[PDB]
């Protein structure tokens, strides 16, 4: 049975911050992926 080999879901992580003089909250931008291909493994973050 012949099968395709597509590579892993990857991209770039861009952190958006207002500066440390204002606050410490950050927003990440996973470039080039869908809302389902982002890691939804936040409940299992200790597995890496």
């Amino acid at each position: 049975e012949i099968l395709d080999i597509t590579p892993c879901s990857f991209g770039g992580v861009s952190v958006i911050t207002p500066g440390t003089n204002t606050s410490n909250q950050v927003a990440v931008l996973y470039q080039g992926v869908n809302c389902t291909e982002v890691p939804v493994a936040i409940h299992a973050d200790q597995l890496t």
């Binding site: 990857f10 770039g12 470039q31």
Partner: protein, 49 residues
């Protein structure tokens, strides 16, 4: 008259080593080539805007 061009960002680890070579950790021995290329690509991307 042209105004802007295509903004391109290059992942050096997947290009040089690959998405299947976990034993190719020797790219860290070469220093900071990926950082000094990503800085130029980021400058090109913020220049085209």
């Amino acid at each position: 008259l042209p105004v802007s061009m295509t903004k391109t960002s290059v992942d050096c680890t997947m290009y040089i080593c690959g998405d299947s070579t976990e034993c190719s950790n020797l790219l860290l021995q070469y220093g900071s080539f990926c950082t000094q290329l990503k800085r130029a690509l980021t400058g090109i991307a913020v220049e085209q805007d």
